[PDB]
Design a binder for these strands. Structure first.
Length: 610
RNA sequence: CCAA
């Protein structure tokens, strides 16, 4: 993959490798694709267009500090809001490590299955999951308006209901539709984004061609004269300059081709206020008449559509970030997992024909220079680690004297199920394997004491989606995972069980188990290597890993006689194995019994009668 | 292969 992060091409037509279709993601190496301390997203997703938008909103300080801040309280009902907060917090703390948005994608697919007048907004987003072209037109802008609308709707349903997202994106739109003479009707609705679509009077590129500001002025105050056998006159006007401006560019290809020639069209920064019943936007303050509270706006980021030379379509994200240790603006470009730091002259330049701006974001001046606040800047509510929150009808819950600290030993094991299969297209060129879901996890008390080796959660994860295979032999999940059909296990949602794991790694607990990197990858949570004690890495044999049942029969006297797997018992045996490994390490017998399990396994064929 |  040499010469793949080059974002510039000497030719104005050849698309550089930084925007090409990245190779599909046993252990994929991401070190030659990201050198910065800001993470990328796993391209193995059902949505061809949501990864670019998530990165666009991560670097808006006023939104990022809020949705991450919403992780103080247990907002289990706001699925799309908290899952976005779980993703934003994970992205910030990974500092470059790969991240997956499968949890957010699952909450979006379950929310869009809703079967308000504009309900086709749900169906238009659901129609873009089964993947034909990669992404259609006007579809990224449709989700941009959909994501912001659903977030605000969930923002009013959180604990201590907030309106912070409305104060940032709120566009007080006056919709005057004149039916007859001297008699008109006005509508006032708060819009999260501004839609620049269906432009008719292209009088902008003469002397106001020109820059982007005239397009924003028309979308803020326009008079359309088309409706129906009526052809009514409609006048849309906004009287609000919010903190951030969400722009949705959807123009004609003739207007898109003419807009590439105008150098410096997409303006870096501008200022403007409201003087008349319309909004005026000027480059410098010398053109501003003043007489009102002036507002300064700077570009935060934008999502552009890349048309490959192989006639392939994909989205990328340009991003600016401010460092409080100096006065500097660093640009960042985001492919799926390709992240590079670029210059401003290249980020604003759009003379290339394979580049089309789709979603632009402008931010307030004094608010962009504000630093990003992590979730651990407030007091988080660790009440779920003790409460019994089940959705149905041999462990023991936790107490406040067992309050986990930075270093509390815990044994974790997770069971999963199969929703779909590989479902590939072919040499493989289009499709990828997907759809593995979580069924049951269990955390065990690992701290030495009276309550040692005894679990404290045994939660099963409810799932309404159609499964393809239970993997019952390796999952121990009888068909009782249905919400009203719980056989014997106490069920729980996915948002509640994820918070138990998130709070454990938030405090700094130390997880032990076998193959913990797999569970955390499918649970969709990233834990630092300092808090992971994997028995596979410890008892590693070159490139071969040993089965947990085998180690229980060669390192201990526990012949499990494995029939139906049992996660609560699997995590228990993984805990005491870490205790034996500690014993065999304190006394210098480390690389003496490890060599004993290789050779004894050659004649035994890595198996024992069970 | 491990994980499942």
């Amino acid at each position: 993959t040499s010469d793949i992060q080059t974002y510039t091409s000497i030719n104005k037509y050849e698309v550089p490798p930084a925007y090409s279709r990245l190779p599909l993601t046993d252990n994929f190496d991401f070190t030659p694709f990201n050198n910065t301390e800001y993470s990328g997203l796993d391209p193995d997703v059902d949505n061809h267009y949501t990864n670019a938008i998530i990165q666009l909103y991560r670097f808006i300080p006023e939104m990022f500090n809020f949705v991450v801040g919403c992780l103080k309280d247990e907002n289990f009902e706001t699925t799309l809001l908290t899952d976005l907060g779980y993703l934003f917090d994970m992205m910030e703390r990974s500092h470059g490590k790969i991240c997956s948005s499968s949890n957010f994608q699952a909450s979006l697919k379950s929310l869009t299955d809703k079967r308000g007048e504009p309900q086709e907004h749900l169906e238009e987003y659901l129609e873009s999951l089964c993947i034909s072209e990669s992404i259609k037109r006007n579809m990224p802008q449709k989700f941009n308006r959909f994501l912001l609308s659903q977030l605000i709707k969930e923002e009013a349903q959180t604990v201590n209901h907030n309106i912070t997202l409305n104060q940032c994106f709120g566009l007080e739109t006056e919709i005057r539709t004149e039916c007859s003479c001297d008699h008109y009707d006005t509508t006032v609705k708060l819009l999260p984004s501004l839609s620049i679509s269906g432009i008719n009077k292209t009088v902008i590129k003469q002397l106001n061609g020109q820059n982007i500001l005239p397009y924003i002025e028309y979308a803020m105050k326009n008079v359309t004269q088309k409706n129906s056998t009526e052809t009514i006159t409609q006048e849309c006007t906004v009287k609000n300059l919010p903190s951030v401006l969400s722009l949705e560019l959807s123009l004609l290809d003739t207007e898109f081709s003419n807009i590439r020639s105008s150098k410096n069209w997409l303006t870096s920064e501008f200022y403007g206020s409201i003087i008349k019943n319309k909004a005026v936007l000027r480059s410098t303050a010398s053109e501003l008449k003043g007489t009102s509270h002036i507002f300064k706006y700077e570009l935060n980021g934008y999502v552009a559509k890349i048309t490959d030379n192989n006639n392939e379509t994909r989205l990328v994200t340009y991003v600016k970030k401010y460092n409080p240790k100096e006065n500097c603006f660093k640009w960042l470009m985001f492919n799926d997992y390709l992240v590079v730091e670029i210059t401003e002259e290249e980020a604003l330049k759009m003379t290339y024909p394979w580049k089309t701006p789709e979603i632009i974001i402008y931010c307030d001046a004094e608010e962009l220079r504000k630093p990003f606040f992590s979730v651990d800047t407030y007091s988080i509510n660790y009440d779920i680690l003790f409460r019994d929150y089940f959705a149905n009808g041999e462990y023991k819950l936790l107490t406040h004297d067992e309050a986990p600290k930075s270093g509390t030993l815990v044994a974790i094991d997770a069971a999963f199920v199969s929703l779909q299969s590989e479902l590939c297209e072919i040499i493989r060129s289009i499709i990828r394997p997907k759809r593995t879901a979580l069924a049951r996890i269990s955390i065990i008390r690992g701290e030495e004491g009276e309550l040692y080796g005894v679990p404290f959660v045994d939660d099963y994860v409810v799932n309404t989606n159609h499964i393809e295979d239970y993997l019952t032999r390796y999952s121990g999940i009888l068909p009782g995972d249905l919400d009203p059909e719980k056989s014997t296990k106490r069920l729980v949602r996915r948002n509640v069980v994820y918070r138990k794991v998130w709070l454990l790694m938030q405090l700094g607990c130390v997880f032990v188990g076998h193959g913990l990197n797999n569970d955390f990858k499918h649970i969709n949570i990233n834990v630092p290597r300092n808090q992971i004690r994997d028995t596979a890495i410890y008892f590693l044999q070159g490139k071969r890993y040993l089965s947990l049942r085998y180690l229980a029969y060669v390192l201990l006297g526990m012949n499990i006689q494995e029939g139906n797997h049992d996660s609560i018992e699997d995590a228990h045996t993984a805990l005491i194995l870490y205790k034996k490994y500690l014993h065999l390490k304190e006394k210098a017998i480390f690389e003496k019994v490890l060599n004993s399990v290789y050779e004894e396994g050659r004649a035994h064929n890595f198996k024992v009668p069970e």
